[PDB]
């Protein structure tokens, strides 16, 4: 669906109404009365094979490769774990800086786009939320401060969503690693992280 | 103003313009050390400025001169007082700002081996037309009883000799390193040399 007012063509997707409130002078009702909503329209530099820099999490400073636009606005990246230490991961596009360099512009690598795109199809948005029972299992362990840590790490390893996602991660790494290592300077560029040095001002930079 | 300390030599600067730029820096929070305060300049004839100091000398508490205006006359304490009059030195914050300034006559040890900066927005050469009259602070303060103008000059002579020897050794070192640099450029893979040449390194 879409609507077109003054030549704009906003796109519509369904949305559910949840919150309830009080009526004026008899029983209650739901607040929201809408049935569709407008989509997000990411900015015009997010493409499939581009490299980027994580800015916020445990992997702040590290570089990665875009993999998919995930139907809920945010997007999945790998900086191939075999090369970098960054697994399949979902990030908000507002916590990334995207450079102008593309993996599939190297003639050594540009021939593998289709086998990359066939693997990326199975990447899903629901597979990233951990189920309630795993939460319950991890949170029962608070009732020695080193056995609990690996015990938590072990409950995670047995979640079938984790195993499914790990399989695809391994397949991508196996496909794409050997060709990357042939470009020495590029592999070194991927293995290092980005930092700010004095004498670069961030409103005259390009990156 | 994002540094632990700035060292200024005041040779050739005008007193008011320099004092107005030090005070705002101090208020924003920045240690400042000023050296060679005896070479500061003022923008009138020497006689005219001596008249002004004479007027400053004749005001005192009538009943008890121990109180009241204290007539400091070392060339660095004068800059200290001129800066103090551009700050709100009667609040706690403005008294903190005043304690972050250090002034010297000549150039003592810790700072003779540091890097000195200037402020072009206050230089006499850029601010004062060439047919106007000006005086030197050391001469004026010697005329009203300071008595150490000759000794600091004698010390500065030796300081400049030691600096000249240091500069000689440094220039030799830079030449000897440049030759090594130009030899090592031929031992690098062509791609690194080409990317270094493209950006002029």
């Amino acid at each position: 669906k879409h609507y077109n007012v003054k030549g704009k063509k906003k796109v519509l997707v369904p949305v559910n109404a949840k919150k309830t409130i009080n009526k004026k002078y008899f029983g209650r009702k739901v607040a929201s009365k809408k049935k569709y909503v407008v989509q997000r329209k990411l900015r015009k530099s997010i493409e499939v094979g581009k490299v980027a820099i994580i800015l916020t999490g445990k992997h702040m400073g590290k570089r990665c490769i875009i993999t998919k636009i995930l139907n809920s606005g945010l997007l999945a990246v790998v900086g191939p774990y075999e090369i970098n230490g960054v697994p399949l991961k979902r990030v908000d596009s507002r916590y990334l800086v995207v450079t102008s360099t593309n993996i599939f512009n190297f003639e050594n690598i540009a021939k593998l786009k289709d086998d990359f795109l066939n693997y990326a199809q199975d990447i899903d948005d629901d597979s990233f939320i951990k189920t309630l029972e795993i939460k319950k299992k991890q949170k029962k362990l608070l009732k020695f401060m080193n056995n609990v840590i690996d015990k938590i790490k072990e409950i995670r390893k047995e979640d079938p969503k984790v195993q499914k996602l790990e399989g695809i991660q391994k397949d991508i790494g196996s496909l794409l690693k050997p060709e990357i290592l042939k470009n020495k300077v590029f592999a070194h560029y991927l293995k290092s992280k980005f930092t700010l040095r004095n004498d670069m001002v961030l409103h005259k930079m390009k990156f | 103003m994002y540094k632990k300390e700035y060292v200024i030599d005041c040779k050739g600067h005008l007193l008011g313009r320099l004092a107005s730029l030090i005070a705002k820096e101090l208020l924003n929070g920045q240690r400042i050390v000023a050296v060679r305060c005896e070479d500061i300049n003022i923008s009138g004839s020497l006689y005219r400025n001596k008249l002004k100091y004479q007027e400053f000398l004749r005001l005192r508490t009538n009943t008890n001169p121990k109180k009241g205006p204290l007539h400091l006359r070392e060339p660095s304490k004068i800059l200290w007082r001129c800066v103090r009059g551009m700050l709100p030195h009667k609040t706690y914050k403005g008294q903190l700002a005043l304690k972050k300034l250090k002034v010297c006559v000549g150039m003592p040890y810790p700072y003779d081996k540091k890097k000195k900066y200037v402020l072009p927005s206050a230089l006499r050469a850029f601010r004062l037309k060439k047919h106007r009259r000006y005086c030197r602070l050391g001469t004026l303060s010697s005329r009203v009883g300071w008595n150490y103008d000759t000794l600091v000059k004698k010390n500065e002579v030796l300081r400049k000799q030691v600096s000249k020897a240091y500069y000689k050794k440094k220039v030799n070192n830079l030449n000897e390193k440049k030759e090594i640099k130009t030899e090592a450029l031929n031992l690098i893979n062509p791609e690194q040399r080409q990317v270094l040449e493209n950006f002029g390194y």
């Binding site: 800015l55 400073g61 916590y95 990334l96 930092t195 700010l196 | 994002y2 924003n28 929070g29």
Partner: protein
């Protein structure tokens, strides 16, 4: 050689004021390499963090943060007006802040 930076440095000046009145709803910030009005506009949506230390432990740690936003410029020289969630105390008027780069564009 460790602990990458990923922000630009700043210094917190006083409040938004006139002579004799205060208005502590807004606060003035200076950014290190920015000294024109047109270059200050570049930063007009970024998040601002003010980090300081305490002497007792509070939630296991001795560091806490107050969060803010960059709202507009302050005229011809690269000062900016910022708004925080609580009011910044006056005992901070030369201290350090982080102009982050999170809401990236």
């Amino acid at each position: 050689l460790q602990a990458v930076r990923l922000y630009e440095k700043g210094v917190i000046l006083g409040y938004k004021r006139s002579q004799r009145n205060q208005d502590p709803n807004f606060t003035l910030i200076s950014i290190k390499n920015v000294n024109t009005k047109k270059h200050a506009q570049f930063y007009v949506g970024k998040r601002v963090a003010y980090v300081y230390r305490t002497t007792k432990h509070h939630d296991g740690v001795k560091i806490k943060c107050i969060w803010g936003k960059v709202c507009r410029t302050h005229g011809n020289s690269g000062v900016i007006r910022a708004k925080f969630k609580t009011h910044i105390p006056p005992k901070a008027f030369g201290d350090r802040v982080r102009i982050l780069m999170y809401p990236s564009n």
